[PDB]
């Protein structure tokens, strides 16, 4: 059918997921169920206030930043910002994955047997399932996508978990397709965490008692329920209005002036959401459209409706058994791929204005795709590629035949070829800075920074042209105006290219570039503690192979006793740099090179034991 064709799961799996979720109420912290070729891990939900807001967190929404070592993929690559999640849910997962529980050994056993693994849960068990799926992806799937098979995550009325960087990172890695979230139309738990803590502090415990399917002895005082609902929906309206105003670039200056004064929730949807009514099942993939729908599907249409909605929103958290039993009868639509959405959203209770804003949310993604197509068309042209080809095939060999190298030529010479190279450097900087400017404003799809062709082209451009920008910086004495290149001079486009390439190369093996560099430094045996080395090698040019000339300019002219350690580190990294093609070994040992002329004046004691003694 269309449901399975879209999501990759069938009715039998959904039924088994719901059954395991029901069983999970009794077991302690999780339950495992084995059925033929499928293994299901179901997580227990909780109904205390401290299970949604951590009592020791001092922020207004109970969020915390993830650890870059444990979740190295959950960030923005070029910018370098990590993602944030709910603290209580993360602590729950950390308790479960503690070696004293046997969860990890069970997961490993399931992996060895080559079965299909599923994480599932109801209520906050669903949020724990989401975080467990991310943990499994990071720890197994990215290492060996053949030995470790794809996962599935199924949730029933779960609250939101992560922020917008969380969703962006899931989109870039192509992992969003594994997640599926079922939401009843009027269910309140998916909306709760769009509200400030101080808004719902007084009434949250009683509503959590009401929501617990096991507790039935508490009073259902209508006043507290109505108050809770009203406050949650007020904060939701604020968040949705600001979000839609922001994504269209409508009122930037007024929005910034006002932003100084507000506190808004950072949580966003992640994965595919499926809305259910008594007649339809609607699936959506776009995060912003889902936010708008979460606000607009819960509004009342008469004064008679308003008298039943606060209680309906609580009663609908216990209606997923009926949804699973009646799934096969209803209609199915996919919102993103339908020409006309008016009728579907009419049946879901969305008015004309909310329909406008949902339409805008979808149109923004269409615009991003068109922008990407324009960029690709530009960068595939032969006239564009001929500039890189010229630098590769004409300027470099000619400057090598002069026995001084193209870095020194660009730095000191006034010939026609140098003028041509300067013109082409500026021309290429224009294109790459336009792409950077579009990226910084979120005008491109989430998957752009992972595209292999773009990575290859940007790596080639960086390795070819960054040395000429360093030469340009030092020819005009800009280092005596605003300081060393590595601190304040380096353009952002090269940093983005370097980080993209490093992530692409290193993610299969788990470790990040900084620890790789620090281990390689420790391996040189300089005789120093980690802190002293970290202080001595701050803002150094030995992290990247295309900043070799910046490092050489900085160390040149100083006495050896002051720069011993930096000289040794650079000489240590040079051989690996040459092997990978980051540095050209036909350029830097020439007779008229700056590096050779400096290196041949160092003390002979150092030169005797240098690794490069035979090159020069």
């Amino acid at each position: 059918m269309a449901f399975e064709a879209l999501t990759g799961i069938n009715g039998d799996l959904i039924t088994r997921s719901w059954s395991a979720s029901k069983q999970a109420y009794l077991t302690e912290r999780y339950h495992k169920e084995e059925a033929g070729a499928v293994v299901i891990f179901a997580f227990q939900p909780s109904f205390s206030e401290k299970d949604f807001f951590d009592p020791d967190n001092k922020s207004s929404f109970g969020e915390i930043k993830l650890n870059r070592v444990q979740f190295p993929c959950m960030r923005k690559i070029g910018k370098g910002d990590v993602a944030t999640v709910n603290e209580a849910f993360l602590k729950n997962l950390e308790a479960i994955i503690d070696p004293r529980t046997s969860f990890q050994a069970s997961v490993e056993m399931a992996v060895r047997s080559r079965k299909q693994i599923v994480f599932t849960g109801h209520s906050s068990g669903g949020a724990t399932a989401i975080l467990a799926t991310v943990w499994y992806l990071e720890k197994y799937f990215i290492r060996n996508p053949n030995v470790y098979l794809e996962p599935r995550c199924v949730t029933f009325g779960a609250p939101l978990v992560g922020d917008s960087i969380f969703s962006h990172a899931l989109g870039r890695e192509k992992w969003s397709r594994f997640f599926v979230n079922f939401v009843s139309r009027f269910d309140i738990v998916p909306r709760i965490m769009l509200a400030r803590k101080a808004s719902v502090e007084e009434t949250l415990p009683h509503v959590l008692a009401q929501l617990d399917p096991r507790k039935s002895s508490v009073q259902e005082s209508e006043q507290r329920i109505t108050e809770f609902y009203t406050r949650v929906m007020r904060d939701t309206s604020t968040v949705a209005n600001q979000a839609v105003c922001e994504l269209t670039g409508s009122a930037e200056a007024f929005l910034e002036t006002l932003s100084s004064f507000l506190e808004l929730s950072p949580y966003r949807p992640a994965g595919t959401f499926v809305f259910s009514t008594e007649k339809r099942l609607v699936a959506v993939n776009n995060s912003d459209a889902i936010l708008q729908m979460l606000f607009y599907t819960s509004q009342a249409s008469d004064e008679q409706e308003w008298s039943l909605i606060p209680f309906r929103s609580i009663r609908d958290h216990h209606s997923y058994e009926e949804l699973v039993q009646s799934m096969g009868k209803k209609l199915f639509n996919h919102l993103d791929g339908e020409n006309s959405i008016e009728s579907t959203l009419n049946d879901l209770g969305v008015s004309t204005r909310g329909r406008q804003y949902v339409q805008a949310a979808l149109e923004e993604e269409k615009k991003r795709v068109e922008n990407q197509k324009k960029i690709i068309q530009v960068i595939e042209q032969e006239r564009f590629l001929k500039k890189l080809a010229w630098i590769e095939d004409e300027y470099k060999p000619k400057c090598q035949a002069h026995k001084n190298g193209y870095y020194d030529s660009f730095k000191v010479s006034n010939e026609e070829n140098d003028f041509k190279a300067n013109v082409k450097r500026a021309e290429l900087a224009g294109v790459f800075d336009e792409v950077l400017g579009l990226m910084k404003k979120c005008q491109l799809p989430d998957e752009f920074e992972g595209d292999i062709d773009w990575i290859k082209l940007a790596t080639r451009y960086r390795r070819l042209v960054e040395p000429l920008d360093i030469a340009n910086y030092h020819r005009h004495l800009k280092n005596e105006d605003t300081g060393p290149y590595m601190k304040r001079g380096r353009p952002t486009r090269y940093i983005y290219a370097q980080r993209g390439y490093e992530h692409y190369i290193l993610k299969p093996n788990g470790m990040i570039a900084e620890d790789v560099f620090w281990n390689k430094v420790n391996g040189l045996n300089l005789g120093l503690q980690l802190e002293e080395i970290q202080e001595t090698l701050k803002n150094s040019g030995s992290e990247c192979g295309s900043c070799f000339w910046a490092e050489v300019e900085e160390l040149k002219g100083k006495p050896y006793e002051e720069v011993e350690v930096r000289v040794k580190t650079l000489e240590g990294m040079l051989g690996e740099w040459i092997t990978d093609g980051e540095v050209d070994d036909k350029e830097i040992f020439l007779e008229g090179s700056t590096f050779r002329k400096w290196w041949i004046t160092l003390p002979k004691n150092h030169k005797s034991h240098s690794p490069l003694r035979d090159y020069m």
Binding site: N414, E415, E416, F419, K420, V423
Partner: protein
């Protein structure tokens, strides 16, 4: 000494023995110019044309043929000798040995009976040989003098019944023309060039009153004389050039009627003039004008509004007028205009809206011009054959490419090269 002569001069003479008389004379004339300096093509062409009675294309052919034989070097240019382009901004060069051979050849025999009187190098005063033998007339047709500053008492009388061309090179700020010009009964072309770093002032300019038989005049790096209503008209002048010249208020006199002085002028060139702010309105009164060049004049901002009177005008060059902001609307009435050059006009933004009336137009050059659009009238130009524009402006010429068949639209490649700095 003898060996250098017999080993180089004899070989070069043997090579020159194949030349026919006109080409040999063109080769020899090149010895009248200083060493290691460039020679603009216009000076040489006008000398040859007024000496052997040719046309411009024929003399250009002579020069190119001389180049083909390795006796002469051309200077690189992107539009060297293309159709309708000018000759005063392209150059040639001659190797020192060749110039030495030419100088020795022209300076053979008695002084009086020479064909060409040439001074090999810069000297304070004229050579003593000329004065020693001044008792007799000279039969030369070419005279070239290269000196420094001269004063009225530095000159002595000389009779030159047969002289046809006179060339003068000097480097100073004041100069007095030789008084023997008034007795030059056969002088047809006059060339006065200042090499100094500031404009020079010429005195005793009244000799030009009796120069009825002049046909061309070249002035360079000098103060243009303050023309007045009492000037004696030049009835035979056909060409007039002003290169790197200072105009001051010479042409700004309101009571000046320029058309009276030049009854038959057909060519006018004003180049590299920084203090030119507008053209005198009487220039439109010269009905015999066929081509106008006003180039590298950065402060001129508009053209006179009486241009429609110049009915014989065919060529109009204006390139590198960095501040010219529009073309007069009268240009659409000219019935013989053929060529327009507005390249490097960075303040010009649009063309006249009725430019489709000039049906004789054949070629247009807009290299590095700041045009934002072209009028929809140019679809009516049936005779157009060649257009040159920037690579970014090709989309504006699709309509004409469709309408006018046989039209070639060329996109000029941006040029590197560091030769402009070699001043």
């Amino acid at each position: 000494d003898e060996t250098h002569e017999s080993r180089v001069f004899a070989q070069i003479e043997a090579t020159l023995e194949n030349l026919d008389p006109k080409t040999r004379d063109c080769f020899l004339v090149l010895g009248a110019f200083p060493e290691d300096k460039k020679i603009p093509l216009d000076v040489l062409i006008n000398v040859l044309v007024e000496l052997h009675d040719l046309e411009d294309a024929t003399a250009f052919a002579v020069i190119v043929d001389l180049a083909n034989r390795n006796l002469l070097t051309l200077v690189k240019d992107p539009r060297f000798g293309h159709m309708y382009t000018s000759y005063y901004d392209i150059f040639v060069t001659q190797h020192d040995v060749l110039r030495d051979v030419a100088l020795r050849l022209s300076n053979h025999g008695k002084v009086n009976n020479r064909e060409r009187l040439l001074m090999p190098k810069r000297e304070s005063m004229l050579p003593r040989e000329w004065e020693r033998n001044n008792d007799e007339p000279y039969k030369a047709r070419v005279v070239s003098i290269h000196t420094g500053e001269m004063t009225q008492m530095d000159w002595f009388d000389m009779e030159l019944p047969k002289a046809e061309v006179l060339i003068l090179h000097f480097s100073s700020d004041k100069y007095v023309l030789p008084p023997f010009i008034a007795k030059m009964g056969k002088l047809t072309a006059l060339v006065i060039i200042n090499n100094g770093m500031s404009p020079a002032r010429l005195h005793d300019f009244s000799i030009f009153t009796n120069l009825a038989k002049l046909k061309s005049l070249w002035l360079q790096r000098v103060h243009v004389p303050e023309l007045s209503s009492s000037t004696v008209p030049l009835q035979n002048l056909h060409k007039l050039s002003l290169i790197f010249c200072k105009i001051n208020t010479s042409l700004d006199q309101t009571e000046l009627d320029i058309a009276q002085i030049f009854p038959k002028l057909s060519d006018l060139t004003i180049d590299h003039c920084d203090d030119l702010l507008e053209l005198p309105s009487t220039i439109c009164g010269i009905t015999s004008l066929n081509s106008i060049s006003i180039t590298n004049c950065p402060r001129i901002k508009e053209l006179p509004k009486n241009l429609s009177k110049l009915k014989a005008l065919q060529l109009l060059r204006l390139y590198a007028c960095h501040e010219l902001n529009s073309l007069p609307v009268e240009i659409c009435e000219l019935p013989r205009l053929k060529y327009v050059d507005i390249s490097q006009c960075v303040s010009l933004s649009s063309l006249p809206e009725k430019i489709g009336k000039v049906k004789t137009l054949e070629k247009i050059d807009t290299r590095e011009c700041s045009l934002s659009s072209i009028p929809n009238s140019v679809v009516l130009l049936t005779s157009l054959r060649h257009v040159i524009c920037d690579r970014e402006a090709l989309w504006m010429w699709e309509k004409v490419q469709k309408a006018v068949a046989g039209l070639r639209v060329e996109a000029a490649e941006k040029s590197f090269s560091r030769d402009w700095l070699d001043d």
